[PDB]
Write an enzyme that holds these catalytic residues in place. Structure first.
Site, PDB file in Angstrom:
ATOM      1  N   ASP A 120       0.953  -1.258  -0.006  1.00 10.86           N
ATOM      2  CA  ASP A 120      -0.082   0.076  -0.175  1.00 10.86           C
ATOM      3  C   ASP A 120       0.973   1.290  -0.063  1.00 10.86           C
ATOM      4  O   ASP A 120       1.832   1.491   0.942  1.00 10.86           O
ATOM      5  CB  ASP A 120      -0.959   0.015   1.218  1.00 10.86           C
ATOM      6  CG  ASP A 120      -2.202  -0.969   1.280  1.00 10.86           C
ATOM      7  OD1 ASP A 120      -2.371  -1.505   0.073  1.00 10.86           O
ATOM      8  OD2 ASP A 120      -2.758  -1.032   2.183  1.00 10.86           O
ATOM      9  N   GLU A 139     -12.403   1.866  -5.617  1.00  7.07           N
ATOM     10  CA  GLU A 139     -11.182   1.215  -6.128  1.00  7.07           C
ATOM     11  C   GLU A 139     -11.466   0.647  -7.669  1.00  7.07           C
ATOM     12  O   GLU A 139     -12.243  -0.050  -7.762  1.00  7.07           O
ATOM     13  CB  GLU A 139     -10.805   0.087  -5.156  1.00  7.07           C
ATOM     14  CG  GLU A 139      -9.267  -0.719  -5.695  1.00  7.07           C
ATOM     15  CD  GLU A 139      -8.818  -1.648  -4.720  1.00  7.07           C
ATOM     16  OE1 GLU A 139      -7.824  -2.467  -4.784  1.00  7.07           O
ATOM     17  OE2 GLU A 139      -9.445  -1.703  -3.431  1.00  7.07           O
ATOM     18  N   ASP A 149     -10.277  -6.516   9.628  1.00  6.84           N
ATOM     19  CA  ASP A 149      -9.546  -7.800   9.571  1.00  6.84           C
ATOM     20  C   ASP A 149      -8.861  -7.766  11.052  1.00  6.84           C
ATOM     21  O   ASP A 149      -8.921  -8.996  11.705  1.00  6.84           O
ATOM     22  CB  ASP A 149      -8.912  -7.541   8.568  1.00  6.84           C
ATOM     23  CG  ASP A 149      -9.594  -8.029   7.156  1.00  6.84           C
ATOM     24  OD1 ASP A 149     -10.145  -8.829   7.104  1.00  6.84           O
ATOM     25  OD2 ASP A 149      -9.276  -6.936   6.238  1.00  6.84           O
ATOM     26  N   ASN A 198     -19.362  -7.421   9.014  1.00  5.25           N
ATOM     27  CA  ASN A 198     -20.083  -6.068   9.554  1.00  5.25           C
ATOM     28  C   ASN A 198     -21.568  -5.972   8.705  1.00  5.25           C
ATOM     29  O   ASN A 198     -22.144  -6.956   8.065  1.00  5.25           O
ATOM     30  CB  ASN A 198     -19.151  -4.990   9.259  1.00  5.25           C
ATOM     31  CG  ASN A 198     -19.086  -4.702   7.644  1.00  5.25           C
ATOM     32  OD1 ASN A 198     -20.017  -5.033   6.888  1.00  5.25           O
ATOM     33  ND2 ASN A 198     -18.001  -3.832   7.189  1.00  5.25           N
ATOM     34  N   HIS A 236     -19.589  -7.648  13.695  1.00  5.45           N
ATOM     35  CA  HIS A 236     -18.959  -6.437  14.119  1.00  5.45           C
ATOM     36  C   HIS A 236     -19.465  -4.998  13.261  1.00  5.45           C
ATOM     37  O   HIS A 236     -19.490  -5.031  12.237  1.00  5.45           O
ATOM     38  CB  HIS A 236     -17.536  -6.324  14.067  1.00  5.45           C
ATOM     39  CG  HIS A 236     -16.668  -6.919  12.898  1.00  5.45           C
ATOM     40  ND1 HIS A 236     -16.465  -6.199  11.839  1.00  5.45           N
ATOM     41  CD2 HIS A 236     -16.540  -8.104  12.234  1.00  5.45           C
ATOM     42  CE1 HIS A 236     -16.013  -6.773  10.802  1.00  5.45           C
ATOM     43  NE2 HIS A 236     -16.055  -7.930  11.110  1.00  5.45           N
ATOM     44  N   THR A 237     -19.799  -4.106  14.202  1.00  7.77           N
ATOM     45  CA  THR A 237     -20.137  -2.839  13.778  1.00  7.77           C
ATOM     46  C   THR A 237     -19.646  -1.763  14.296  1.00  7.77           C
ATOM     47  O   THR A 237     -18.837  -1.881  15.450  1.00  7.77           O
ATOM     48  CB  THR A 237     -21.391  -2.638  13.382  1.00  7.77           C
ATOM     49  OG1 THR A 237     -22.072  -1.570  12.693  1.00  7.77           O
ATOM     50  CG2 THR A 237     -22.425  -2.661  14.684  1.00  7.77           C
TER      51      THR A 237
END
EC number: 2.7.1.-
Length: 450
Positions: free
Chosen positions: A34, A88, A436, A292, A342-343
């Site tokens: 990245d 992206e 992640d 999520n 998960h949020t």
């Protein structure tokens, strides 16, 4: 009220003691570099002028399918800027890649779901990892942390695990160029609604779920050196190219199943609906899945429960009972033993396995998330202690009250049917691979606690 701070502190101490028991995690398939560039007004304007403001503006109203030219690159950037929305695209031109390399970047970081979890599980937590790296160039290797991070190589057909920095030179750089802009960034006559970024992926490997030849021919021998697996990188596949790689993943899942090696997937958003449905069918081979609110809604949606998907994402924070109906739906269709939702303000887990260790793993992963958001990175395991000082957020407390009344959660734990339902309120910094970090940290630490 629940003493969440005491529970968070105990959870961290328990995982610090237990995380050392994990012998090895297999991590496949997507690793990249990245390269982050902080956009500047005058430079971006001059570059748009050089290539033709006209054409660039055209691509700002409608994204290309991929980036073949420099006006497409710059116009795609502009699309994200004026919508304040992330996008992206693959960069498929060598001339454009060269253009991007010369334009450069300000910060270099490890990228890809495998790379970031290798650095977290291996470098920070000290758990041995075996990582799948499509192109391990010298630059790619330089971005791994210290610790028990290995890639497999074969000498006289003998498996040897080695650190990335000792791998042979020759492979190429797979770079995702991350063009970042602040809130209200101005260019020409536009101003960004939100802070965000555009990603041009100069990457011929991960978008097709490239698999190294040695992992195709010797997967069983590699997998035997692990105890758990985390699979990642299915999300970009399309109807055109999904055939061979999904067949590989399925064969690898069957071997992991034969070997008794429990596998986890974070169900990253998968735009192609046919492939999303194929990943659902793969879930039968997984012990654990993380997702999520957008991901869960996406999955419930492609399954034809459009009204439920709307409820999952409709309220902020997500109507927890709708979420749970989606989790219960998914867990009965797939047979997974574990789903970690998960949020922003809270996590939920629905598990066949029972006990406090499910909660402790969720709390630990929320501390890791909060430490990463605050520091930007995590360098050492005991640094996660810094997350203890982050306040629990209002949304988490609001959802707790609903779940206390509707399920009968005590200290975040209750039961429905033959599942345990586990809830925690998140510690919110609000400032990447957070998703992640969350679902890999909960999965691995829960196993270490059991």
């Amino acid at each position: 009220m629940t003493n969440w701070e005491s529970l968070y502190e105990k959870a961290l101490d328990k995982v610090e003691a237990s995380i050392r028991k994990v012998r090895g995690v297999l991590l496949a398939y997507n690793t990249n570099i990245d390269a982050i560039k902080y956009l500047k007004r005058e430079d971006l304007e001059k570059r748009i002028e050089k290539v033709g403001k006209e054409e660039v503006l055209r691509y700002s109203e409608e994204l290309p399918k991929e980036i073949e030219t420099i006006p497409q690159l710059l116009g795609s950037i502009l699309w994200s800027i004026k919508r304040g929305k992330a996008a992206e695209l693959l960069v498929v031109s060598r001339e454009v890649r060269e253009y991007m390399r010369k334009w450069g970047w300000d910060e270099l970081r490890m990228g890809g779901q495998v790379g970031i979890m290798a650095n977290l599980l291996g470098g920070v937590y000290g758990i041995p990892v075996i990582a799948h790296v499509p192109q391990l160039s010298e630059l790619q290797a330089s971005l791994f942390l210290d610790g028990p991070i290995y890639v497999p190589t074969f000498e006289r057909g003998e498996l040897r695990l080695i650190h990335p920095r000792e791998f042979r030179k020759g492979e190429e750089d797979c770079i995702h160029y991350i063009y970042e802009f602040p809130r209200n960034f101005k260019v020409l006559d536009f101003e960004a609604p939100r802070e965000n970024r555009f990603i041009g992926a100069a990457d011929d490997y991960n978008p097709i779920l490239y698999v190294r030849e040695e992992w195709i021919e010797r997967f069983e021998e590699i997998a035997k050196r692990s105890e758990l697996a985390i699979i990642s990188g299915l999300h970009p596949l399309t109807q055109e190219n999904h055939g061979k790689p999904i067949k590989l993943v399925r064969e690898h899942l069957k071997i992991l199943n034969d070997l008794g090696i429990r596998a986890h997937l974070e169900f990253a958003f998968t735009p192609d609906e046919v492939v999303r449905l194929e990943i659902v069918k793969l879930l039968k081979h997984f012990y654990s899945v993380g997702l999520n609110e957008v991901e869960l809604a996406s999955v419930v949606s492609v399954m034809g429960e459009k009204e439920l998907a709307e409820r999952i994402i409709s309220k902020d924070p997500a109507d927890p009972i709708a979420v749970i109906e989606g989790l219960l739906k998914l867990i009965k269709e797939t047979g997974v033993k574990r789903i970690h939702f998960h949020t922003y303000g809270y996590y939920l887990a629905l598990t066949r396995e029972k006990g406090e260790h499910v909660r402790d793993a969720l709390l630990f992963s929320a501390l890791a998330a909060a430490t990463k958001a605050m520091k930007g990175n995590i360098e050492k395991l005991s640094d996660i202690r810094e997350g203890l000082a982050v306040p629990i957020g209002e949304q988490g407390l609001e959802v707790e009250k609903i779940l206390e009344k509707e399920f009968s959660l005590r200290d975040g734990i209750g039961s429905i049917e033959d599942y345990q339902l586990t809830f925690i309120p998140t510690k919110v910094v609000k400032k990447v691979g957070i998703g992640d970090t969350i679902s890999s940290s909960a999965f691995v630490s829960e196993f270490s606690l059991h």
